[PDB]
Design a protein around this motif. Structure first.
Motif, short mmCIF file in Angstrom:
data_model
loop_
_atom_site.label_atom_id
_atom_site.label_comp_id
_atom_site.label_asym_id
_atom_site.label_seq_id
_atom_site.Cartn_x
_atom_site.Cartn_y
_atom_site.Cartn_z
N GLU A 77 46.53 26.21 40.76
CA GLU A 77 45.14 25.85 40.50
C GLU A 77 44.18 26.87 41.11
O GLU A 77 43.18 27.23 40.48
CB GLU A 77 44.84 24.43 41.00
N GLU A 78 44.47 27.36 42.32
CA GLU A 78 43.58 28.36 42.90
C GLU A 78 43.66 29.69 42.16
O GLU A 78 42.66 30.40 42.06
CB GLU A 78 43.87 28.54 44.40
N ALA A 79 44.84 30.05 41.63
CA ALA A 79 44.93 31.25 40.81
C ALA A 79 44.09 31.11 39.55
O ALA A 79 43.39 32.06 39.14
CB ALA A 79 46.39 31.53 40.46
N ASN A 80 44.14 29.94 38.91
CA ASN A 80 43.29 29.70 37.74
C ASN A 80 41.82 29.81 38.11
O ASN A 80 41.03 30.40 37.37
CB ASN A 80 43.60 28.33 37.14
N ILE A 81 41.44 29.26 39.27
CA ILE A 81 40.05 29.34 39.71
C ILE A 81 39.64 30.79 39.92
O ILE A 81 38.54 31.20 39.54
CB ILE A 81 39.83 28.50 40.98
N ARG A 82 40.51 31.59 40.54
CA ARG A 82 40.18 33.00 40.77
C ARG A 82 40.00 33.75 39.46
O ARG A 82 39.05 34.53 39.30
CB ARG A 82 41.26 33.66 41.62
N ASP A 83 40.91 33.53 38.51
CA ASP A 83 40.78 34.19 37.21
C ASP A 83 39.49 33.78 36.53
O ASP A 83 38.80 34.61 35.93
CB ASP A 83 41.98 33.85 36.33
N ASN A 84 39.13 32.50 36.62
CA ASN A 84 37.92 32.01 35.98
C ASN A 84 36.67 32.61 36.62
O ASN A 84 35.72 33.01 35.92
CB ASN A 84 37.90 30.49 36.06
N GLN A 85 36.66 32.69 37.95
CA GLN A 85 35.53 33.30 38.65
C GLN A 85 35.38 34.76 38.27
O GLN A 85 34.26 35.24 38.05
CB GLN A 85 35.71 33.16 40.17
N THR A 86 36.49 35.49 38.17
CA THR A 86 36.38 36.89 37.76
C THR A 86 35.96 37.02 36.30
O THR A 86 35.31 38.00 35.93
CB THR A 86 37.69 37.62 38.00
N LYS A 87 36.33 36.05 35.46
CA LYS A 87 35.85 36.05 34.08
C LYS A 87 34.32 35.97 34.05
O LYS A 87 33.66 36.77 33.38
CB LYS A 87 36.48 34.88 33.31
N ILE A 88 33.75 35.00 34.78
CA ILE A 88 32.29 34.91 34.78
C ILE A 88 31.68 36.13 35.46
O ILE A 88 30.57 36.55 35.12
CB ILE A 88 31.81 33.60 35.43
N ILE A 89 32.39 36.74 36.42
CA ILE A 89 31.88 37.94 37.08
C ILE A 89 31.78 39.09 36.09
O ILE A 89 30.78 39.82 36.07
CB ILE A 89 32.75 38.30 38.29
N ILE A 90 32.81 39.30 35.27
CA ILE A 90 32.73 40.39 34.29
C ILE A 90 31.68 40.07 33.23
O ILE A 90 31.02 40.97 32.72
CB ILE A 90 34.11 40.69 33.65
#
Lengths: 33, 33
Positions: free
Chosen positions: B14-27
């Motif tokens: 779940e935290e890996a998914n959160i990190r990927d999602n945060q970087t998605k919004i960052i890009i």
């Protein structure tokens, strides 16, 4: 205990899907600017 | 111990998914510039 952990998997999966979906609409809003 | 390691898998996922999602919004933010 098995049932509790397996429904924990269920709620983790559904809330992860919700988070991904919310960020999808968020990036849509960002690019709509 | 099995239960502890398996919920460790759960929280890692779940935290890996959160990190990927945060970087998605960052890009998305980066390209919105």
């Amino acid at each position: 205990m098995q049932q509790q952990q397996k429904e924990a998997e269920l709620l983790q999966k559904e809330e992860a899907n919700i988070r991904d979906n919310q960020t999808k609409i968020i990036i849509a809003q960002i690019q709509s600017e």
